[PDB]
Ligand binder design. Structure first.
Ligand SMILES: C=CC[C@@H](C(=O)NCC)[C@@H]1N=C(c2ccc(Cl)cc2)c2cc(OC)ccc2-n2c(C)nnc21
Length: 110
């Protein structure tokens, strides 16, 4: 990995760690629309994303730069905001986790 992508991998480890598990767990695996009963999810969200998919792409060295990594993580959060009403518990959780991501991502090295 490039030096910037190592920082990205370190953020990803933190997002999956026990410290943040109370609000991060909804984002661990892909949305199973049938299991959750949200039969309109794939009509509204055209590009699903989740942390296990980000992790698999990083493992296979599939990100070209830090920007591609950030776009996926932000996609994951934007899907959550797009589908759900603003006062929903899961949107608060997404908020909370995204503040962890954005704060540490802003500390990128040269
Ligand atoms: C995709 C389904 C929509 C949400 C839902 O279940 N109900 C609202 C109509 C759902 N809520 C949640 C959710 C709702 C309440 C609380 Cl406290 C935590 C998560 C959700 C749950 C999961 O369990 C394995 C996985 C993905 C979730 N998720 C994401 C991500 N964005 N919305 C959700």
């Amino acid at each position: 990995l490039s030096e910037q992508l190592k920082h990205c991998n370190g953020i990803l480890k933190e997002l999956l760690s026990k410290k943040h598990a109370a609000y991060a767990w909804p984002f661990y695996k892909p949305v199973d629309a049938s299991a959750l009963g949200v039969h309109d999810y794939h009509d509204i969200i055209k590009h699903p994303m989740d942390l296990s998919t980000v992790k698999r792409k990083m493992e296979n060295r599939d990100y070209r730069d830090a920007q591609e990594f950030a776009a996926d993580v932000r996609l994951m959060f934007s899907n959550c905001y797009k589908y759900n009403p603003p006062d929903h518990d899961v949107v608060a959780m997404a908020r909370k986790l995204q503040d962890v991501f954005e704060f540490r991502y802003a500390k990128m090295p040269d």
